[PDB]
Amino acid sequence: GSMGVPICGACRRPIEGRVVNAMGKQWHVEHFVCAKCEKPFLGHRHYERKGLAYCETHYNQLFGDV
Numbered sequence: 294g295s296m297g298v299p300i301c302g303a304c305r306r307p308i309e310g311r312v313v314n315a316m317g318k319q320w321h322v323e324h325f326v327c328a329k330c331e332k333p334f335l336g337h338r339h340y341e342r343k344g345l346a347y348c349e350t351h352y353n354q355l356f357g358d359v
């Protein structure tokens with residue numbers, strides 16, 4: 294009877310549908326958002342920076358590998 298459920302690092306709640314593995318954790322596909330505007334990537338692409346998510350523009354606005 295070992296555990297068997299991811300937990301959204303956003304609300305620390307047991308996820309149960311589609312999980313997002315980021316920050317070396319798990320996030321509700323609905324709570325995984327940019328770390329600057331909070332825009333969830335339900336079905337979009339996200340960007341990571343310093344260990345934090347960022348939209349395509351905020352990530353870049355924040356850095357953009359440049």
Ligand SMILES: [Zn+2]
Nearest residue numbers: 301304321324
């Ligand atoms: Zn969550």
Ligand SMILES: [Zn+2]
Nearest residue numbers: 327330348351
């Ligand atoms: Zn953003």
